[PDB]
Design a binder for this molecule. Structure first.
Ligand SMILES: [Mg+2]
Ligand SMILES: [Mg+2]
Ligand SMILES: [Mg+2]
Ligand SMILES: [Mg+2]
Ligand SMILES: [Mg+2]
Ligand SMILES: [Mg+2]
Ligand SMILES: [Mg+2]
Ligand SMILES: [Mg+2]
Ligand SMILES: [Mg+2]
Ligand SMILES: [Mg+2]
Ligand SMILES: [Mg+2]
Ligand SMILES: [Mg+2]
Ligand SMILES: [Mg+2]
Ligand SMILES: [Mg+2]
Ligand SMILES: [Mg+2]
Ligand SMILES: [Mg+2]
Ligand SMILES: [Mg+2]
Ligand SMILES: [Mg+2]
Ligand SMILES: [Mg+2]
Ligand SMILES: [Mg+2]
Ligand SMILES: [Mg+2]
Ligand SMILES: [Mg+2]
Ligand SMILES: [Mg+2]
Ligand SMILES: [Mg+2]
Ligand SMILES: [Mg+2]
Ligand SMILES: [Mg+2]
Ligand SMILES: [Mg+2]
Ligand SMILES: [Mg+2]
Ligand SMILES: [Mg+2]
Ligand SMILES: [Mg+2]
Lengths: 58, 79, 94, 137
RNA sequence: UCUGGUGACUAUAGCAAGGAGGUCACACCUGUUCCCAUGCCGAACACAGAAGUUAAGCUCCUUAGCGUCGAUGGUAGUCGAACUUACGUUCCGCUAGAGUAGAACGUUGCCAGGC
RNA sequence: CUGGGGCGGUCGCCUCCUAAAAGGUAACGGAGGCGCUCAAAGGUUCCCUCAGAAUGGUUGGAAAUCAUUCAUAGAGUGUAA
RNA sequence: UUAUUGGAGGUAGAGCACUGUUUGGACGAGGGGCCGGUUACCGAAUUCAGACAAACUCCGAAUGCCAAUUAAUUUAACUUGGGAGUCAGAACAUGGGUGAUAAGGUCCGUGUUCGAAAGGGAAACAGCCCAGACCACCAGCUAAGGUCCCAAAAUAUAUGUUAAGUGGAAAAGGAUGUGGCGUUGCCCAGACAACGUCGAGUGACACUGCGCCGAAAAUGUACCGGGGCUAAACAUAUUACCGAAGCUGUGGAUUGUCCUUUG
């Protein structure tokens, strides 16, 4: 349906492969959120960076 | 007094594949660069003097097996 | 020749295989005549006592769920360090 | 005193040390054996000292096998030399063991003689060892 | 359907063994007069033939003996993460090689003939 | 140039390994070659298919050569790999 | 950037089908003991089993790479022209060479940080863990790490281990130190000790957790930061709190994008 994603860990000290994924989700600073819809391409980007974000089912 | 007698090397030659499977190419473009024939030519593909594989016409490129353990390149027409 | 088995469920991960071996259990499969591939569980201590009384090559009537199958032993993977059996393959014969 | 008669390349890279035994970790030729528990190199002087102390205790009774051969040469640069003017001359021949590998096998003797003969050998290797039987079941 | 010609397919199509088959096709076979031919040999190649034969090639059956193909399950290795400096451990994805069960004594397009 | 400098050695080109399954990638790191040749060892059209092993056979240096069965190239391919 | 498809290539690992290396056992041919032959010995061939490889491969990943889809989320990319500075790099983790499986060593690859980055922790400490400072505030929520006093927050709950101040610097080896889990011997017929008595348990093996010895250096206790600790140590679970210039709250400044009342 919809998902709420929150950048909970900061992004510095991380490889650039993981920084570009966080930008592709549309997250900007720490504790900043975004609301998108569920999609198997969106779950792939959450899978890559799952130790940095938090997902709730909206 | 000690010395060595190994310091020589050649300049490397940029071999290997140059276009990808499924990609549209123009009618004279180099597909694969090799010593000897690791990959044969197939349809609409020429084989150069230094064993370079190149396309005859413009189209999409397909890598495909040939026998048990042989490989070839073809280019097919419609784009 | 009356050993008991428990059917494993789908997709054992790495953790619950080594958690299964820190008990006295060992993973196993059955296949062969008249059956299908079923992956099971066997107690290690009970398995040794059955082998040591019917031999290396004998017939075992083990039960999978409800039914019982006459089963011989095909192969087994062994850990030579720390000396425990880590996998056993079962073969149905009729 | 074990060494190969001819080698294609005299100067080689040193072997990879981490991991487990690739193979050769069950006794096949004899009755008893000595397996390794940690990881080291064995430099072909150790297995000459260990084979002699193996042999004189058994009073030339049963047979003894060695499952290890030193294949790899290693080099050493001479005394008090600056770094880097080529790779030095060879020094000796090593063989790499990892935990699991059987080192010696004995046969043709009683069990308590085999434990003592392998115990005397084990004090001459640089690796922790363990006494094993011929596995079955 | 049978035979033949000719194409497609990683030998599951191969190799070996055993047994049947023929003047319709095919082949051994007859001959060197002619085109043509052999570092010598009409063996081969080419030509002229149709007395003979299913022995062989060939085709059809039988077999898993060798080769080939080959899961499931487990293990080795490893991307990412978390502890740590140990010839490391733990979690989660992916997942071999070897070995086992098994598959397999080909499948199929076009034409002509014989049904 | 240089694990201070000197003495020693090296300075251009080709091929392997290191090189981390695209390409590329250093060290006074490990191994070797070049500074040509061919008037056919070029082009085209037709034919042919090996070394090696085994078994027999005057010379047999064991193996030269001959016949026979197998033999995935192990042969040969001007010159290193 | 991800999902899905397709493809190139020979690492890790495995393996011995080629090339080389190697251990045992058989088979027989040859020389070969002899009296030409036996038998012993030798080397070569063929086989059975079992091992090794950066310059070996019958095999062969994970990841990375090249591309295409009216895919989904994002915001860059490219060309032309004007103006530069840079060509002494360092530590950490990891894949490798060299060296001595030595160096805060040296040389390459892949990432982070420093350089050019304050703030909190690590006693102090460019490169380690958390985290990126527009400016006020005597307001709140948290990260890494922590909650007996120095010094902010639990002398908090529950279970167990340790007796060495281990914790709070090291090995081969040695040992009736103590807990846990298994297999198997001798049991009240009387063992197992000591000399008929003794009257209940007694041994071996195996895998393990914590600890002991091994342990000697120079101005002054002298690696827990100090006091001090038998838990304020260690392990496993739970619930609370402290904790940053991170994030929220209130006000203000500058620039920009929208709508646009230029608010
Ligand atoms: Mg093996
Ligand atoms: Mg004739
Ligand atoms: Mg497999
Ligand atoms: Mg690469
Ligand atoms: Mg490459
Ligand atoms: Mg030279
Ligand atoms: Mg390897
Ligand atoms: Mg290497
Ligand atoms: Mg290799
Ligand atoms: Mg420069
Ligand atoms: Mg420089
Ligand atoms: Mg340095
Ligand atoms: Mg270092
Ligand atoms: Mg680097
Ligand atoms: Mg500077
Ligand atoms: Mg920066
Ligand atoms: Mg700072
Ligand atoms: Mg401080
Ligand atoms: Mg410190
Ligand atoms: Mg600073
Ligand atoms: Mg709070
Ligand atoms: Mg916390
Ligand atoms: Mg103070
Ligand atoms: Mg306080
Ligand atoms: Mg102490
Ligand atoms: Mg200690
Ligand atoms: Mg001590
Ligand atoms: Mg003192
Ligand atoms: Mg003190
Ligand atoms: Mg802020």
């Amino acid at each position: 349906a919809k998902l709420q994603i929150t950048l909970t860990r900061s992004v510095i000290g991380r490889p650039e492969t993981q920084r570009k994924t966080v930008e592709a989700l549309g997250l900007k600073k720490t504790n900043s959120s975004v609301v998108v819809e569920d999609n198997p391409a969106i779950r792939g980007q959450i899978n890559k960076v799952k130790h940095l974000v938090t997902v709730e089912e909206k | 007094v000690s010395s060595t007698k190994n310091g020589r090397d050649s300049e490397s030659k940029r071999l290997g594949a140059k276009r990808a499977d499924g990609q549209f190419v123009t009618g004279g473009s180099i597909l694969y660069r090799q010593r000897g024939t690791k990959i044969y030519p197939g349809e609409n593909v020429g084989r150069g003097g230094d064993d370079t594989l190149f396309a005859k016409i413009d189209g999409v490129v397909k890598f495909e097996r040939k026998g048990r353990d042989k490989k070839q390149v073809s280019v097919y027409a419609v784009a | 020749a009356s050993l008991k088995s428990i059917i494993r469920q789908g997709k054992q991960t790495r953790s619950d295989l080594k958690q299964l071996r820190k008990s006295g259990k060992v993973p196993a499969v059955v296949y062969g005549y008249g059956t299908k591939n079923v992956s099971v569980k066997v107690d290690e201590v009970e398995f040794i006592k059955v082998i040591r009384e019917v031999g290396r090559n004998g017939v075992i009537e083990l039960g999978v769920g409800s039914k019982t199958i006459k089963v011989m032993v095909a192969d087994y993977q062994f850990d030579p360090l720390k000396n425990q059996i880590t996998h056993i393959d079962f073969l149905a014969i009729n | 005193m074990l060494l190969p008669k001819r080698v294609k390349y005299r100067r080689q890279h040193r072997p990879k040390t981490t991991g487990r035994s690739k193979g050769g970790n069950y006794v096949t030729f004899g009755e008893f054996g000595l397996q390794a528990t940690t990881t080291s190199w064995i430099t072909s002087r150790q297995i000459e000292s260990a084979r002699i102390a193996m042999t004189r205790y058994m009073k030339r009774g049963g047979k003894v096998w060695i499952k290890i051969f030193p294949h790899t040469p290693y080099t050493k640069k001479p005394l008090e030399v600056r770094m880097g003017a080529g790779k030095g001359a060879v020094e000796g021949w090593i063989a790499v063991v990892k935990p699991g590998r059987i080192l010696f096998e004995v046969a043709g003797v009683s069990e308590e003689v085999a434990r003592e003969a392998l115990r005397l050998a084990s004090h001459k290797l640089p690796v922790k060892t363990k006494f094993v039987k011929r596995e079955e079941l």
